[PDB]
Amino acid sequence: NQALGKKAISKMLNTCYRILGLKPTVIFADQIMYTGFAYAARSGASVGID
Amino acid sequence: ARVTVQDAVEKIGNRFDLVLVAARRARQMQVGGKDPLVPEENDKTTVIALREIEEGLINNQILDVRERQEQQEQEAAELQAVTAIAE
């Protein structure tokens, strides 16, 4: 429910590992990567001189 | 299928004994020693060994018990065989 920058993501992974365990966390990391790529693309975030 | 050994380690609580045990069982199943205890699923011998370990069907104790049983059947057959070759 936050704005979920880099640090927040890493601590979310760490909390998942401390609460659930190895396998759920590995599946979690894969899902995070997939969905982050997907919405980075959807965004079309670019960089212009303006 | 296999992606992690976390539960296998949970059984044999070392991750260093686990390798030695799984290698023992897998060399068994690979050279003409034995046949899997979990239904093989087109898995290679090492992954089958791990899948067996997970179910609590293989550990060091199990393997030693099985080995001594094998040696004793070996003794029985071999004594009978020498006796037969006598007469």
From Swiss-Prot, chain A:
Disulfide bonds: none annotated. Acetylated on several lysine residues in the presence of glucose. This is DNA-directed RNA polymerase subunit beta'. Belongs to the RNA polymerase beta' chain family. DNA-dependent RNA polymerase (RNAP) catalyzes the transcription of DNA into RNA using the four ribonucleoside triphosphates as substrates. It comes from the Bacteria. Signal peptide: none annotated. Co-administration of salinamide and rifampicin or salinamide and myxopyronin suppresses the emergence of resistance to both antibiotics. The RNAP catalytic core consists of 2 alpha, 1 beta, 1 beta' and 1 omega subunit. When a sigma factor is associated with the core the holoenzyme is formed, which can initiate transcription. The rRNA transcription and antitermination complex (rrnTAC) consists of RNAP, NusA, NusB, NusE (rpsJ), NusG, SubB, ribosomal protein S4, DNA and precursor rRNA; S4 is more flexible than other subunits.
Curated annotation (Swiss-Prot), chain B:
GO terms for molecular function: DNA binding; DNA-directed RNA polymerase activity. It comes from the Bacteria. It catalyses: RNA(n) + a ribonucleoside 5'-triphosphate = RNA(n+1) + diphosphate. Keywords: DNA-directed RNA polymerase, Nucleotidyltransferase, Transcription, Transferase. The keyword Cytoplasm does not apply. GO terms for biological process: DNA-templated transcription. GO terms for cellular component: DNA-directed RNA polymerase complex. The RNAP catalytic core consists of 2 alpha, 1 beta, 1 beta' and 1 omega subunit. When a sigma factor is associated with the core the holoenzyme is formed, which can initiate transcription. NCBIfam families: rpoZ. This is DNA-directed RNA polymerase subunit omega. The gene is rpoZ.
